[PDB]
Coordinates of C-alpha atoms in Angstrom, one line a residue:
Chain A
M1 CA 55.6 -29.9 -25.6
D2 CA 53.9 -27.2 -22.9
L3 CA 53.0 -24.4 -23.7
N4 CA 56.1 -21.9 -23.2
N5 CA 57.9 -23.8 -25.6
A6 CA 55.0 -23.9 -27.9
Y7 CA 55.1 -20.1 -27.5
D8 CA 59.0 -20.0 -28.5
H9 CA 58.5 -22.0 -30.6
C10 CA 56.4 -18.9 -32.3
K11 CA 59.1 -16.1 -31.4
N12 CA 61.6 -18.2 -33.1
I13 CA 59.7 -17.5 -36.4
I14 CA 58.9 -13.8 -35.7
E15 CA 62.2 -13.1 -35.1
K16 CA 63.3 -15.6 -38.4
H17 CA 61.2 -13.8 -40.7
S18 CA 60.9 -9.9 -39.3
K19 CA 63.3 -7.2 -37.9
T20 CA 60.7 -4.9 -37.6
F21 CA 57.3 -6.4 -36.4
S22 CA 59.1 -9.2 -33.4
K23 CA 61.2 -5.7 -31.5
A24 CA 58.2 -4.1 -31.6
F25 CA 55.8 -6.7 -30.0
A26 CA 59.2 -7.8 -28.8
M27 CA 58.2 -4.2 -26.0
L28 CA 54.1 -5.7 -25.4
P29 CA 53.8 -7.2 -21.4
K30 CA 54.1 -11.1 -21.6
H31 CA 50.5 -12.6 -22.3
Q32 CA 49.8 -9.7 -25.0
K33 CA 53.4 -10.5 -26.6
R34 CA 53.0 -14.4 -26.2
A35 CA 49.8 -14.2 -27.7
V36 CA 50.7 -11.9 -30.8
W37 CA 53.9 -14.4 -31.8
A38 CA 51.2 -16.8 -31.8
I39 CA 49.2 -15.2 -34.3
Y40 CA 51.8 -13.8 -36.5
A41 CA 52.5 -17.7 -36.6
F42 CA 48.5 -18.3 -38.1
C43 CA 49.3 -16.0 -40.8
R44 CA 53.5 -16.9 -41.5
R45 CA 52.4 -20.5 -42.2
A46 CA 49.0 -19.3 -44.6
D47 CA 51.3 -16.8 -46.9
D48 CA 54.0 -19.6 -46.7
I49 CA 52.2 -22.0 -48.0
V50 CA 50.7 -20.4 -51.1
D51 CA 54.3 -18.0 -51.5
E52 CA 55.6 -21.8 -51.3
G53 CA 54.9 -25.3 -50.9
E54 CA 54.3 -27.1 -54.0
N55 CA 50.4 -28.4 -54.5
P56 CA 49.2 -24.7 -52.7
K57 CA 45.7 -25.1 -53.6
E58 CA 45.9 -27.9 -51.7
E59 CA 47.7 -27.1 -48.6
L60 CA 46.0 -24.3 -48.1
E61 CA 42.4 -26.0 -48.6
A62 CA 43.6 -28.7 -45.8
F63 CA 44.7 -25.6 -44.1
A64 CA 41.8 -24.7 -43.5
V65 CA 39.6 -27.2 -42.5
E66 CA 42.6 -27.5 -40.0
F67 CA 41.6 -24.1 -38.9
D68 CA 37.7 -24.9 -38.7
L69 CA 39.0 -27.8 -36.3
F70 CA 40.7 -25.5 -34.4
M71 CA 37.7 -23.3 -33.8
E72 CA 35.3 -26.2 -32.9
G73 CA 37.6 -27.0 -30.4
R74 CA 38.1 -29.9 -31.5
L75 CA 41.9 -29.9 -33.0
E76 CA 44.2 -32.5 -30.9
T77 CA 48.1 -31.9 -32.5
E78 CA 51.0 -31.5 -31.3
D79 CA 52.1 -28.9 -33.5
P80 CA 53.2 -25.7 -31.7
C81 CA 51.8 -23.4 -33.8
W82 CA 48.1 -24.1 -32.9
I83 CA 48.8 -25.3 -29.2
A84 CA 49.9 -21.5 -28.9
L85 CA 47.6 -20.4 -30.8
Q86 CA 44.8 -21.9 -28.7
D87 CA 46.5 -20.6 -25.2
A88 CA 46.3 -16.6 -26.6
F89 CA 42.1 -17.6 -27.9
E90 CA 41.4 -19.3 -25.0
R91 CA 43.5 -16.3 -23.3
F92 CA 42.0 -13.2 -24.5
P93 CA 38.8 -11.8 -26.5
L94 CA 39.9 -13.0 -30.1
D95 CA 37.4 -13.1 -33.1
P96 CA 37.6 -15.9 -36.5
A97 CA 36.0 -13.5 -38.5
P98 CA 39.6 -11.6 -39.6
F99 CA 41.5 -14.5 -39.3
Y100 CA 39.0 -16.2 -42.0
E101 CA 39.3 -13.5 -44.2
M102 CA 43.0 -14.2 -44.5
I103 CA 42.5 -17.1 -45.9
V104 CA 40.0 -15.4 -48.4
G105 CA 43.5 -13.3 -49.0
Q106 CA 45.5 -16.2 -49.4
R107 CA 43.1 -17.5 -51.9
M108 CA 43.6 -14.5 -53.8
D109 CA 46.7 -15.1 -54.2
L110 CA 46.4 -18.6 -56.0
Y111 CA 45.4 -17.5 -59.8
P112 CA 46.6 -15.2 -62.4
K113 CA 46.0 -12.2 -60.7
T114 CA 45.8 -8.4 -61.8
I115 CA 45.0 -4.7 -60.1
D116 CA 43.0 -2.5 -61.9
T117 CA 42.0 0.2 -59.4
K118 CA 43.6 1.2 -57.0
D119 CA 40.4 0.0 -55.2
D120 CA 40.7 -3.6 -56.5
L121 CA 44.6 -2.5 -54.6
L122 CA 42.8 -1.7 -51.5
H123 CA 40.7 -5.2 -51.5
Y124 CA 43.6 -6.9 -52.1
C125 CA 45.3 -5.1 -49.2
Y126 CA 42.6 -4.8 -47.0
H127 CA 42.2 -9.3 -47.5
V128 CA 45.8 -9.6 -46.5
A129 CA 47.3 -7.2 -44.0
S130 CA 45.2 -4.8 -42.5
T131 CA 43.0 -9.2 -41.3
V132 CA 46.5 -9.1 -39.4
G133 CA 46.0 -5.1 -37.8
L134 CA 41.9 -6.8 -36.8
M135 CA 43.4 -9.8 -35.6
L136 CA 45.4 -8.7 -33.2
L137 CA 43.5 -5.7 -31.7
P138 CA 41.5 -7.2 -28.9
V139 CA 45.0 -8.2 -27.8
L140 CA 46.6 -4.5 -28.1
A141 CA 43.7 -2.4 -27.7
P142 CA 40.7 -4.5 -25.2
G143 CA 38.0 -3.3 -25.0
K144 CA 38.5 0.0 -27.1
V145 CA 38.0 -2.2 -31.1
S146 CA 35.4 0.6 -32.3
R147 CA 37.3 2.4 -31.6
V148 CA 41.1 2.2 -33.1
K149 CA 39.7 -0.1 -35.9
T150 CA 39.7 1.8 -39.1
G151 CA 43.0 3.5 -37.5
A152 CA 44.3 0.0 -37.5
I153 CA 42.6 -1.6 -41.1
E154 CA 44.2 1.5 -42.6
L155 CA 47.6 0.9 -41.2
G156 CA 47.1 -2.9 -42.7
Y157 CA 46.9 -0.5 -45.9
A158 CA 49.4 1.5 -45.9
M159 CA 52.3 -1.4 -44.8
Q160 CA 51.2 -4.0 -47.7
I161 CA 51.3 -0.8 -50.2
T162 CA 54.7 -0.8 -48.6
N163 CA 55.3 -3.5 -48.6
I164 CA 54.1 -3.7 -52.6
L165 CA 56.5 -0.1 -53.4
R166 CA 59.4 -2.4 -51.8
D167 CA 58.7 -5.1 -54.0
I168 CA 58.5 -4.3 -57.1
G169 CA 61.1 -7.0 -58.5
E170 CA 60.9 -8.6 -56.7
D171 CA 57.4 -10.1 -57.6
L172 CA 58.3 -9.4 -61.1
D173 CA 60.4 -12.2 -60.7
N174 CA 58.0 -13.7 -59.6
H175 CA 55.6 -13.2 -62.3
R176 CA 52.8 -11.0 -60.0
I177 CA 52.1 -7.0 -60.8
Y178 CA 50.7 -5.9 -58.2
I179 CA 50.8 -2.4 -59.6
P180 CA 47.2 -1.1 -60.6
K181 CA 46.6 -0.9 -64.5
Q182 CA 45.0 2.4 -64.6
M183 CA 47.8 3.7 -63.0
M184 CA 50.5 2.3 -65.6
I185 CA 47.7 4.0 -68.1
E186 CA 47.9 7.6 -66.1
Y187 CA 51.1 7.8 -66.2
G188 CA 52.3 6.0 -69.2
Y189 CA 54.7 3.3 -67.5
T190 CA 53.6 0.1 -70.1
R191 CA 54.5 -3.7 -70.1
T192 CA 57.8 -3.4 -71.4
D193 CA 59.4 -0.6 -68.9
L194 CA 58.5 -3.2 -66.4
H195 CA 59.4 -5.9 -67.7
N196 CA 63.3 -3.7 -68.7
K197 CA 63.3 -2.7 -65.5
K198 CA 63.4 0.4 -65.7
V199 CA 63.1 3.3 -63.5
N200 CA 62.2 6.5 -65.8
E201 CA 60.4 9.2 -64.9
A202 CA 56.7 7.6 -65.1
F203 CA 57.8 4.9 -62.5
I204 CA 58.7 7.7 -59.8
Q205 CA 55.4 9.5 -61.0
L206 CA 53.6 6.5 -60.6
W207 CA 56.5 5.0 -57.5
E208 CA 55.6 8.1 -55.1
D209 CA 51.9 8.2 -55.9
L210 CA 51.1 4.7 -54.3
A211 CA 53.8 6.5 -51.9
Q212 CA 51.8 9.0 -50.7
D213 CA 48.9 7.5 -50.7
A214 CA 50.7 4.6 -48.0
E215 CA 51.7 7.7 -46.1
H216 CA 47.9 9.2 -45.4
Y217 CA 46.6 5.9 -44.2
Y218 CA 50.2 6.0 -41.7
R219 CA 49.7 9.6 -41.2
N220 CA 45.3 8.2 -39.9
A221 CA 46.6 5.4 -38.7
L222 CA 49.1 6.7 -36.4
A223 CA 46.9 9.0 -34.8
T224 CA 44.6 6.9 -33.4
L225 CA 47.3 5.7 -31.1
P226 CA 46.2 7.7 -28.2
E227 CA 43.5 5.8 -27.4
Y228 CA 45.5 2.4 -27.8
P229 CA 46.3 1.3 -23.7
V230 CA 49.7 3.0 -22.9
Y231 CA 51.6 0.0 -23.1
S232 CA 50.7 -0.5 -26.1
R233 CA 51.4 2.5 -27.7
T234 CA 55.4 2.4 -28.3
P235 CA 54.8 -1.2 -29.9
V236 CA 52.2 -0.1 -32.6
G237 CA 54.0 3.2 -33.0
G238 CA 57.2 1.5 -33.3
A239 CA 56.0 -0.7 -35.8
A240 CA 54.2 1.8 -37.6
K241 CA 57.0 4.2 -38.3
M242 CA 59.4 1.1 -38.6
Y243 CA 57.2 0.0 -41.7
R244 CA 56.4 3.8 -42.8
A245 CA 61.1 3.9 -43.0
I246 CA 60.9 1.7 -46.2
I247 CA 59.7 4.5 -48.0
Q248 CA 62.5 7.3 -47.5
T249 CA 64.4 4.2 -47.9
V250 CA 63.5 4.1 -51.9
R251 CA 63.5 7.3 -52.0
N252 CA 67.0 7.8 -50.8
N253 CA 68.1 4.7 -53.0
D254 CA 67.0 6.2 -56.2
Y255 CA 63.9 3.9 -56.3
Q256 CA 65.9 1.3 -57.3
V257 CA 63.7 -1.2 -56.0
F258 CA 64.8 -3.8 -59.9
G259 CA 67.7 -5.5 -57.3
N260 CA 66.0 -2.2 -49.9
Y261 CA 66.9 -2.5 -45.9
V262 CA 65.7 0.0 -43.0
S263 CA 68.4 -0.6 -41.1
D264 CA 69.0 -2.0 -37.4
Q265 CA 70.5 1.7 -36.2
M266 CA 68.1 3.3 -38.5
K267 CA 64.9 0.8 -36.1
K268 CA 66.5 1.6 -33.2
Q269 CA 66.5 4.8 -33.0
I270 CA 62.8 4.5 -34.4
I271 CA 62.1 2.7 -31.0
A272 CA 64.1 5.3 -29.2
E273 CA 62.3 8.1 -30.2
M274 CA 58.6 6.3 -29.1
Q275 CA 60.0 5.4 -25.7
Chain B
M1 CA 61.0 2.2 -105.1
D2 CA 58.4 1.0 -107.6
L3 CA 54.8 -0.9 -106.6
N4 CA 56.9 -4.3 -107.6
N5 CA 59.9 -3.8 -105.1
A6 CA 56.8 -2.1 -102.6
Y7 CA 55.7 -5.2 -103.2
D8 CA 58.2 -7.4 -102.8
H9 CA 58.8 -5.8 -99.7
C10 CA 56.5 -7.4 -98.7
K11 CA 57.8 -10.2 -99.3
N12 CA 60.3 -11.0 -98.1
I13 CA 58.5 -10.2 -94.7
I14 CA 55.7 -12.4 -94.8
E15 CA 58.7 -15.3 -96.0
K16 CA 60.9 -14.6 -92.7
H17 CA 57.5 -14.8 -90.2
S18 CA 54.8 -17.2 -90.9
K19 CA 56.0 -20.7 -93.5
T20 CA 52.9 -21.5 -93.6
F21 CA 50.9 -18.2 -94.8
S22 CA 53.7 -17.2 -97.4
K23 CA 52.9 -21.0 -98.2
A24 CA 49.4 -20.5 -98.1
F25 CA 48.9 -17.0 -99.8
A26 CA 51.4 -17.6 -102.2
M27 CA 48.6 -19.9 -104.5
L28 CA 46.5 -17.1 -105.3
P29 CA 46.2 -15.0 -108.3
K30 CA 48.7 -12.1 -108.9
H31 CA 46.5 -9.0 -107.3
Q32 CA 45.0 -10.4 -105.0
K33 CA 48.6 -12.6 -103.0
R34 CA 50.5 -8.8 -103.5
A35 CA 47.7 -7.2 -101.3
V36 CA 47.5 -10.2 -98.7
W37 CA 51.3 -8.8 -98.7
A38 CA 50.9 -6.1 -98.2
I39 CA 47.8 -6.1 -95.4
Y40 CA 50.1 -9.2 -93.2
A41 CA 53.2 -6.4 -93.4
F42 CA 50.9 -3.6 -91.4
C43 CA 49.5 -6.0 -89.2
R44 CA 53.0 -7.4 -88.7
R45 CA 53.8 -3.8 -87.8
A46 CA 51.6 -3.4 -85.3
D47 CA 52.6 -6.4 -83.4
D48 CA 56.3 -6.8 -83.7
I49 CA 56.1 -3.0 -82.1
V50 CA 53.7 -4.1 -79.1
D51 CA 55.4 -7.0 -78.7
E52 CA 59.1 -6.2 -79.3
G53 CA 60.7 -1.9 -79.4
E54 CA 61.6 0.2 -77.3
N55 CA 58.4 2.8 -76.5
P56 CA 56.1 0.5 -77.2
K57 CA 53.0 2.8 -76.1
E58 CA 54.9 5.7 -78.8
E59 CA 55.2 4.0 -81.2
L60 CA 51.9 2.8 -81.6
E61 CA 50.2 6.0 -81.7
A62 CA 52.4 6.5 -84.2
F63 CA 51.9 4.1 -86.6
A64 CA 48.0 5.8 -85.8
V65 CA 49.0 8.6 -86.4
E66 CA 50.4 7.7 -90.1
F67 CA 47.2 5.1 -90.4
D68 CA 44.9 7.9 -89.9
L69 CA 47.3 10.6 -92.3
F70 CA 47.5 7.3 -94.5
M71 CA 43.2 6.7 -95.2
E72 CA 43.6 11.0 -95.3
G73 CA 45.2 10.1 -98.4
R74 CA 47.9 12.5 -97.3
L75 CA 50.2 11.1 -96.6
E76 CA 53.4 11.0 -97.6
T77 CA 55.9 7.9 -97.6
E78 CA 58.9 6.0 -99.4
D79 CA 58.0 3.4 -96.8
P80 CA 57.7 0.3 -98.8
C81 CA 54.6 -1.0 -96.9
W82 CA 52.9 2.5 -96.6
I83 CA 53.6 1.9 -100.8
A84 CA 52.2 -1.0 -101.3
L85 CA 49.2 -0.5 -98.9
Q86 CA 48.1 2.0 -101.3
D87 CA 47.6 0.3 -104.4
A88 CA 46.0 -2.0 -101.6
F89 CA 43.0 -0.1 -101.0
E90 CA 43.4 1.6 -104.7
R91 CA 43.0 -1.8 -105.8
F92 CA 40.3 -3.9 -104.2
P93 CA 37.1 -2.6 -101.5
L94 CA 39.5 -2.3 -97.9
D95 CA 37.5 -1.4 -95.2
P96 CA 39.2 0.7 -92.7
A97 CA 37.4 -0.3 -90.0
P98 CA 38.9 -3.7 -88.2
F99 CA 42.8 -1.8 -89.3
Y100 CA 41.6 0.7 -86.4
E101 CA 39.8 -2.3 -84.5
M102 CA 43.8 -4.6 -84.7
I103 CA 45.5 -1.4 -83.6
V104 CA 42.7 -1.1 -80.4
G105 CA 43.9 -4.8 -79.8
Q106 CA 47.3 -4.1 -80.0
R107 CA 46.1 -1.3 -77.4
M108 CA 44.9 -4.4 -75.1
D109 CA 48.9 -5.4 -74.8
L110 CA 50.8 -3.0 -73.9
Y111 CA 50.4 -3.1 -69.7
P112 CA 49.7 -6.6 -68.1
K113 CA 47.1 -8.4 -68.9
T114 CA 45.2 -11.1 -66.8
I115 CA 42.1 -12.7 -68.9
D116 CA 39.0 -13.7 -66.6
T117 CA 36.9 -15.8 -68.2
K118 CA 36.3 -17.3 -72.0
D119 CA 34.8 -14.4 -72.5
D120 CA 36.7 -12.2 -72.2
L121 CA 39.5 -14.9 -74.4
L122 CA 37.6 -14.2 -77.5
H123 CA 36.9 -10.1 -77.0
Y124 CA 40.9 -10.1 -77.7
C125 CA 41.4 -12.7 -80.2
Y126 CA 38.3 -11.0 -81.9
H127 CA 40.1 -8.3 -81.6
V128 CA 44.8 -9.6 -82.4
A129 CA 43.1 -12.0 -85.0
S130 CA 40.0 -11.9 -86.1
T131 CA 40.7 -8.8 -87.5
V132 CA 42.7 -10.4 -89.8
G133 CA 40.5 -11.9 -91.3
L134 CA 38.0 -9.0 -92.1
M135 CA 40.2 -7.4 -93.6
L136 CA 41.4 -9.9 -95.8
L137 CA 38.0 -11.0 -97.2
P138 CA 37.1 -7.9 -99.6
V139 CA 40.8 -9.7 -101.5
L140 CA 40.0 -13.5 -100.5
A141 CA 36.0 -13.2 -101.0
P142 CA 35.1 -9.9 -103.1
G143 CA 31.4 -9.5 -102.7
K144 CA 30.6 -12.5 -100.5
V145 CA 31.8 -11.0 -96.9
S146 CA 28.5 -10.8 -95.4
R147 CA 28.0 -14.5 -96.3
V148 CA 31.4 -15.9 -94.7
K149 CA 32.0 -13.0 -92.4
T150 CA 31.6 -15.1 -89.3
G151 CA 33.5 -18.4 -90.2
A152 CA 36.7 -15.8 -91.0
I153 CA 35.6 -14.3 -87.4
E154 CA 36.2 -17.7 -85.8
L155 CA 38.7 -18.9 -87.7
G156 CA 40.4 -15.8 -86.0
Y157 CA 39.6 -17.6 -82.3
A158 CA 40.4 -20.5 -83.6
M159 CA 44.1 -19.4 -85.2
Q160 CA 44.7 -17.1 -82.1
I161 CA 43.6 -20.3 -79.7
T162 CA 46.1 -22.7 -81.1
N163 CA 48.8 -19.3 -81.5
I164 CA 48.0 -19.0 -77.2
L165 CA 48.6 -23.6 -76.4
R166 CA 50.6 -23.6 -78.9
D167 CA 53.5 -20.3 -76.6
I168 CA 52.4 -21.2 -72.8
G169 CA 55.9 -21.1 -72.1
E170 CA 57.2 -18.9 -74.1
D171 CA 54.6 -16.5 -73.0
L172 CA 54.5 -17.3 -69.4
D173 CA 58.8 -16.2 -69.8
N174 CA 57.6 -13.0 -71.6
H175 CA 55.3 -12.5 -68.4
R176 CA 51.8 -13.3 -70.0
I177 CA 49.4 -15.0 -69.2
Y178 CA 45.8 -15.5 -72.1
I179 CA 44.7 -19.2 -69.7
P180 CA 41.5 -17.9 -68.7
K181 CA 41.5 -17.3 -64.7
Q182 CA 38.4 -19.4 -63.9
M183 CA 39.7 -22.8 -65.7
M184 CA 43.1 -22.9 -64.0
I185 CA 40.2 -22.5 -61.7
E186 CA 38.2 -25.0 -62.5
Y187 CA 40.4 -26.9 -63.5
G188 CA 42.6 -26.8 -60.4
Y189 CA 46.0 -25.6 -62.4
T190 CA 47.5 -22.6 -60.6
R191 CA 50.3 -19.7 -60.4
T192 CA 53.0 -21.9 -59.2
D193 CA 52.2 -25.1 -60.5
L194 CA 52.2 -22.5 -64.0
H195 CA 55.2 -21.0 -62.4
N196 CA 57.7 -24.5 -62.1
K197 CA 56.2 -25.7 -66.3
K198 CA 54.6 -28.2 -64.5
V199 CA 52.8 -30.6 -67.2
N200 CA 50.2 -32.8 -64.9
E201 CA 46.7 -33.9 -65.5
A202 CA 45.3 -30.4 -64.3
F203 CA 47.1 -29.0 -67.3
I204 CA 46.1 -31.3 -70.0
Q205 CA 42.4 -31.2 -68.6
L206 CA 42.5 -27.4 -69.8
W207 CA 45.1 -27.1 -72.3
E208 CA 42.4 -30.0 -74.0
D209 CA 39.5 -27.7 -73.3
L210 CA 41.2 -24.6 -75.0
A211 CA 41.7 -26.7 -77.9
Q212 CA 38.2 -28.7 -78.0
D213 CA 37.2 -24.8 -78.6
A214 CA 39.9 -23.9 -81.3
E215 CA 38.9 -27.5 -83.5
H216 CA 35.1 -25.7 -82.9
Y217 CA 35.9 -22.8 -84.6
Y218 CA 37.7 -24.8 -86.8
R219 CA 35.2 -26.6 -88.4
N220 CA 32.7 -24.4 -89.0
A221 CA 35.4 -22.4 -90.1
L222 CA 36.2 -24.8 -92.4
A223 CA 32.4 -25.3 -93.7
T224 CA 31.6 -21.3 -94.9
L225 CA 34.8 -22.6 -98.0
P226 CA 32.8 -24.0 -100.7
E227 CA 31.4 -19.7 -100.4
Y228 CA 35.1 -18.3 -101.3
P229 CA 35.9 -18.2 -104.9
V230 CA 37.4 -21.7 -106.9
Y231 CA 40.6 -19.4 -106.5
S232 CA 40.8 -18.1 -102.7
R233 CA 39.8 -22.3 -101.8
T234 CA 43.2 -24.3 -101.3
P235 CA 44.7 -20.9 -100.1
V236 CA 42.1 -20.8 -97.0
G237 CA 41.9 -24.1 -96.3
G238 CA 44.9 -24.8 -96.6
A239 CA 45.8 -21.9 -93.8
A240 CA 43.4 -23.4 -91.6
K241 CA 44.7 -26.5 -91.8
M242 CA 48.0 -26.2 -91.3
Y243 CA 47.5 -23.9 -88.1
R244 CA 45.3 -26.6 -86.9
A245 CA 47.7 -29.7 -87.2
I246 CA 49.4 -27.2 -84.5
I247 CA 47.1 -28.9 -81.8
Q248 CA 47.8 -32.2 -82.4
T249 CA 51.1 -31.7 -83.1
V250 CA 51.9 -30.6 -79.4
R251 CA 49.0 -33.7 -78.5
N252 CA 52.2 -35.9 -80.3
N253 CA 55.0 -33.7 -78.6
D254 CA 53.1 -35.2 -74.8
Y255 CA 51.6 -31.5 -74.2
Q256 CA 55.5 -30.0 -73.4
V257 CA 54.5 -26.1 -74.2
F258 CA 57.8 -25.0 -71.8
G259 CA 60.4 -25.2 -74.6
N260 CA 56.0 -26.8 -81.5
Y261 CA 56.9 -26.4 -84.8
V262 CA 54.5 -29.0 -87.4
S263 CA 57.3 -29.8 -89.6
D264 CA 57.7 -28.1 -93.2
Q265 CA 56.5 -31.7 -94.5
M266 CA 53.6 -32.1 -92.4
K267 CA 53.2 -28.3 -94.2
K268 CA 53.0 -29.5 -97.8
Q269 CA 50.6 -33.0 -97.8
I270 CA 47.9 -30.8 -95.8
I271 CA 47.5 -28.5 -99.5
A272 CA 47.9 -31.5 -101.3
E273 CA 45.8 -33.1 -100.0
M274 CA 43.8 -29.5 -100.3
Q275 CA 44.8 -29.0 -103.6

């Protein structure tokens, strides 16, 4: 299939898996938008290999080998996702370095994990989320990457913490815990309260402590938005605030995270205010 | 209630929770046997606080405070377990040091845990299992503790590894993983194979590697048995071999540990050969 249909394939991936990101990046100009679809398909595939799929270790090493071949310019395929990414790499000065770091981050999720400190939390968030911001920067802010880089890394922190805070029970059911141990210790929230899906006084203290770190990172990221080109300000800002709004969504639902979505209407309001 | 009935209470605890240990230590002479019941009740209570019970952190600190008061000789109670332990401590030169280390070990299970290396495995096994051997030594081998101490520590390693290898699926259901990460990495056994309760080629390799460490510790522990007094040789040896026999029980059942008991008859045979 041709380039248009390769990109359309990636558009169907992003629309299926994230209403927030697809709404946000749909407001980019044509070629930047198509490149963002292709880069998203790359992140989506690697994460799906690890989080779903039968032999995650062998499937992810074959994905890494395939990217190695791709970067050498010697991958011949009919895979629409690679056809789309090939054009994105040729069309914009994308950097392979954060693409490799993403794979390293995905390797972290192949074996059980314990986050000890906030430091280990940020190290994980960097590799699975900040890297995505870094892959997009040459598309979103051409010639200004060093200037807005720190903000995009922190926006990674902010959205990955937000994701973790929303998905406490989902991750527990899949035998994953991303809450730092030392904060469970600080606040007196034990493994047993967690296994019992308890929303108590100590849980809220711990939850709000993490949420406030996320909010700080969101504010830092949003303060760099004037340095983006005008056509990227509403997409990037809108994405950030739509994702930040999950935190208050959980607050309003009394922190019930053992069974949360920003509504479609809320998303529309956020985009209109950006606009 | 009086001393006899305090000890009988502890006898009912050990008989209810461990057929192996109660059969083994029932062959000790009277007062050593009663002391072993009292010491077992102490370990049983602390472990039950952590593994069951509503507020494990507050319940375990109150258990620790109570032992602090006990050791000062200033705990006044009608609790049969303390009445029994009080006599054991007065009757034999028991050392409080490994009793405190047990509590430290139980503290390790209050918050999520990741074993990285075999080293971290042994550090955990020491505090939750080797300490129990060390509490019993003045009762089992009076005046010979320094001589048989290393063997009892390793018997701790051996039985706790045995326990871990038998309880893989039980611990997974309770969101606990004691398999060292680095061996999952060495053998290519992922979190996803575990969550899927897969008994594959890599699982068996990892399982047998741990089992062979346990077997080495059992052989080391059993080599010290001539240094015990005659009345402790069949209890200690019998306990050790009854617990070791779990490993071959799992082998014979094709390593199916996601749903294993040494039979009552097998236990009888092991004791007869000791005898």
